[PDB]
């Protein structure tokens, strides 16, 4: 009768090189990742997360161990990445996630000239009737970082949300300086 929910967020960010590789054939540097929504260390209950990429790569099955869980790799096309989350408790069934590697922008986002592509989805790992050890591990998770934790799902809108404040404050300071100090010098 014990149910513990661990919210997570998985996805990938991609950056366009601006030109296709000379002889390789890659166009975007992308980083698939799995990270928690709440500021907590997932490794307290996660043993390893495997990322099975396309067979075209030398090693399709990547692995990570610690709270980040990101592999940086370059590619040329979009494909489905199978993410399998293994827990410390071997009696707990691993969780399998399916994420579509997104590298290209939509026409609307392309017209905006934004360089970074982002696609991560909100998810929750439901542990129904977990073992005593797994329950303790889930309940004893510590905080990961001292700062805040954020997500840029789409980014198209988060960039505008950030700019509306950043550029506003920057322009206000620039004006307060230029309009006032020149007249102060005039006096």
């Amino acid at each position: 009768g014990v149910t513990i929910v661990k919210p997570i967020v998985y996805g990938n960010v991609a950056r366009y090189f601006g030109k296709k590789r000379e002889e390789d054939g890659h166009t975007h540097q992308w980083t698939v990742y799995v990270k928690p929504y709440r500021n907590e260390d997932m490794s307290a209950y996660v043993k390893k997360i495997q990322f099975k990429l396309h067979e075209s790569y030398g090693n399709p099955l990547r692995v990570v161990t610690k709270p980040p869980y990101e592999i940086t790799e370059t590619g040329w096309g979009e494909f489905e990445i199978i993410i399998k989350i293994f827990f410390i408790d071997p009696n707990e069934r691993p969780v399998t996630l399916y994420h579509l590697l997104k590298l290209f922008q939509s026409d609307t986002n392309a017209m905006l000239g934004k360089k970074t592509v982002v696609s991560e989805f909100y998810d929750e790992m439901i542990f129904q009737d977990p073992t005593a050890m797994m329950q303790q591990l889930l309940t004893t998770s510590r905080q990961l970082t001292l700062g805040a934790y954020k997500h840029e799902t789409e980014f198209a809108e988060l960039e505008v949300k950030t700019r509306e404040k950043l550029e506003a404050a920057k322009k206000k300071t620039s004006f307060e300086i230029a309009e006032l100090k020149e007249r102060l010098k005039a006096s």
Binding site: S174, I177, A178, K181, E182, L184, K185
Partner: peptide, 15 residues
């Protein structure tokens, strides 16, 4: 103050 005023005016022009 003055050189930074010049620099910031040039920046605002470029901006």
């Amino acid at each position: 103050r003055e050189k930074r005023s010049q620099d910031l005016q040039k920046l605002i022009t470029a901006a």
